[PDB]
């Protein structure tokens, strides 16, 4: 039975994927949608049987769940996230591109469209038309947010699972564009760059660790929020990433209290591409689905396995927000701000961040910014 434990399980996968991805990636910035990846692999899982299916269900933390439940949960969760906040720009583009020849089984195709809005397409990987076709599919499905997803495909390819995810939201409380100033940011490589440092003094959700300062910044109609994990002087983002698990995440969320904060945040954009077949997904537990020995009878009677799992992400943070911060009485009174002095939350060094849905607690996106680019 698929109940609320599925949110905990998918979040448990989220942290594991973030940790595994960082272990195998050299890039300053990391940006992944583990939920979208889970859902994309759930597409392939429909065709999987035996050990092939077991290894997938193990890595995805779905052991015990039936395909009916997984499909019904995946379709309801994605359709809700994509419609819950109209002020928010969010997409989850999925597709399976297979070796032209033996046609894919109708139930597989049907399952894929119904629960994942996924196109299962037969291509001749040798044709010079294929790479433009895939990149074209990406641009239309992401309304040109993500326009290139593949640079090269060998002709010997079998089946490519392609997932393109993007997010852009507006804050509940906006940043004045007039308040944004040029300020330094300390890059992961030990260099210090100059960035467009946004600023606002407002009420935000706030808690602390032995390592970190955490801030919750609500988006749009409070359906989504961003959690900024600011390592303490001496601590690094690697220490943050290594420490995250549900027990630790629970401890953060439960500690979040409305706080008056002086915030400084850079304007940033990050676009990341991952080939999760190479080392990230095998390390997590699924090795067989990427080999000649994989059993996917639900896809075709002909031999087939996952050639590549392409995960491409996009996020953008700017000043834009729903309303202006109203004048508070403390501002007017011309006397003390009592109780607490506004906490200084200055993001001028690398940070870990997550985009979550507040009513269910699902982590849609998780990542690290070590270098500010816009």
Task: Give the rounded distance of the alpha carbon of 180 from its chain centre.
Answer: 27
Q: Where are the strands (E) in 65-158, listed by range? A: 89-99, 119-123
Domains and CATH numbers, the chain: 1-170+266-319 (no CATH), 171-265+325-368 (2.30.39.10)
Among 80, 70, 45, 116, CA closest to 364: 80
Which residues have CB under 8 Å from 352's CB, separation 6+? 228, 229, 231, 237, 240, 241, 244, 366, 367, 368
Torsional sign, CA 192, 23, 312, 17 = negative
Query: What is the number of residues in the chain?
Result: 374
Question: Do residues 113 and 95 make contact, with C-beta atoms less than 8 angstroms apart?
Answer: no
H or E, element range at 357: strand 351-357
Alpha helices in 305-368 (DSSP H): 329-333
Question: Do residues 195 and 182 make contact, with C-beta atoms less than 8 angstroms apart?
Answer: yes
Among 125, 185, 127, CA closest to 157: 125
Among 215, 241, 251, CA closest to 15: 241
Which residues have CB under 8 Å from 316's CB, separation 6+? 168, 268, 269
- Provide the greatest CA pair distance for the chain: 77
User: Rounded to an integer, what distance in angstroms lies between the CA atom of residue 65 and that of residue 56?
Assistant: 12
Alpha carbons within 13 A on the beta-carbon side of 5: 9
Q: Quote the tokens at residue 40.
A: 């994309």
What are residue 372's phi and psi, to 5 degrees?
-85, 120
User: CB burial class (10 A; 0-12, 13-18, 19+) of residue 28?
Assistant: middle
Beta bridge partners of 208: 213
- Helix %, strand %, coil % for the chain, to 5? 30, 30, 40
Q: Where are the strands (E) in the chain, listed by range? A: 30-32, 89-99, 119-123, 159-168, 171-173, 181-186, 192-208, 212-218, 224-231, 257-266, 268-275, 308-317, 321-323, 343-346, 351-357, 363-369
User: Rounded to an integer, what distance in angstroms lies between the CA atom of residue 216 and that of residue 225?
Assistant: 6
**Other Cβ atoms closer than 10 A to 76:** 11
Q: What Å distances lie between residue 226 and 108, 119, 203, 223, CA to CA? A: 36, 31, 14, 11
Question: Do residues 42 and 91 make contact, with C-beta atoms less than 8 angstroms apart?
Answer: no
As annotated, the binding site includes 75, 115
User: Rounded to an integer, what distance in angstroms lies between the CA atom of residue 96 and that of residue 74?
Assistant: 17
As annotated, the binding site for Zn(2+) includes 75, 115
Among 203, 195, 121, CA closest to 162: 121
Residue 143, classed as helix, strand or coil, is: coil
What are residue 337's phi and psi, to 5 degrees?
-80, 100
**Other Cβ atoms closer than 10 A to 255:** 13
């Amino acid at each position: 039975p698929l109940g609320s434990e599925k949110i905990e399980k998918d979040n448990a996968f989220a942290f594991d994927l973030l940790q595994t991805t960082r272990k195998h990636v050299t890039e300053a910035n990391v940006f992944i949608s583990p939920l979208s990846v889970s859902m994309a692999l759930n597409m392939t899982l429909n065709g999987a049987a035996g050990v092939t299916a077991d290894e997938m269900k193990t890595a995805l933390r779905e052991t015990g769940y039936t395909m009916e439940d997984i499909n019904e949960y995946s379709h309801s969760l994605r359709e809700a996230l994509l419609k819950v906040d109209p002020s928010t720009t969010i997409g989850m583009a999925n597709s399976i591109w297979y070796k032209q020849g033996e046609l894919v089984k109708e139930p597989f195709i049907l399952a894929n469209r119904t629960h994942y809005d996924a196109e299962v397409k037969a291509v001749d990987f040798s044709s010079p038309a294929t790479l433009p076709a895939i990149n074209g599919w990406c641009a239309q499905k992401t309304n040109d947010k993500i326009t290139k997803i593949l640079d090269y495909i060998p002709g010997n390819a079998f089946m490519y699972l392609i997932n393109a995810v993007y997010f852009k939201g507006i804050w509940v409380t906006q940043f004045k564009k007039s308040d944004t100033k040029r300020a330094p940011f300390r890059k992961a490589d030990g260099t210090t760059q100059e960035v467009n440092m946004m600023a606002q003094k407002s009420t935000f959700g706030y808690t602390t660790d032995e390592c970190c300062q955490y801030l919750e910044m609500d988006y749009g109609n409070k359906a989504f929020s961003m959690i900024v994990m600011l390592p303490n002087e001496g601590q690094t983002t690697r220490d943050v990433i290594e420490q995250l698990d549900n027990k630790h995440w629970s401890m953060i969320i439960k500690g979040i209290r409305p706080t008056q904060v002086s915030l400084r945040m850079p304007r940033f954009k990050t676009e990341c591409k991952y080939g999760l077949e190479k080392k990230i997904l095998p390390e997590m537990g699924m090795n067989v689905p990427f080999t000649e020995t994989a059993d996917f009878p639900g896809i075709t009677d002909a031999a087939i396995f996952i050639s590549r799992v392409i995960h491409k992400t996009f996020v953008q943070v700017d000043e834009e927000g729903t309303e202006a911060a109203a004048v508070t009485a403390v501002e007017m009174v011309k006397t003390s701000s009592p109780s607490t002095t506004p906490i200084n939350f200055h993001i001028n060094k690398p940070f870990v961040f997550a985009i979550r849905e507040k009513s269910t607690g699902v982590i849609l996106f998780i990542g690290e910014i070590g270098e500010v680019k816009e």
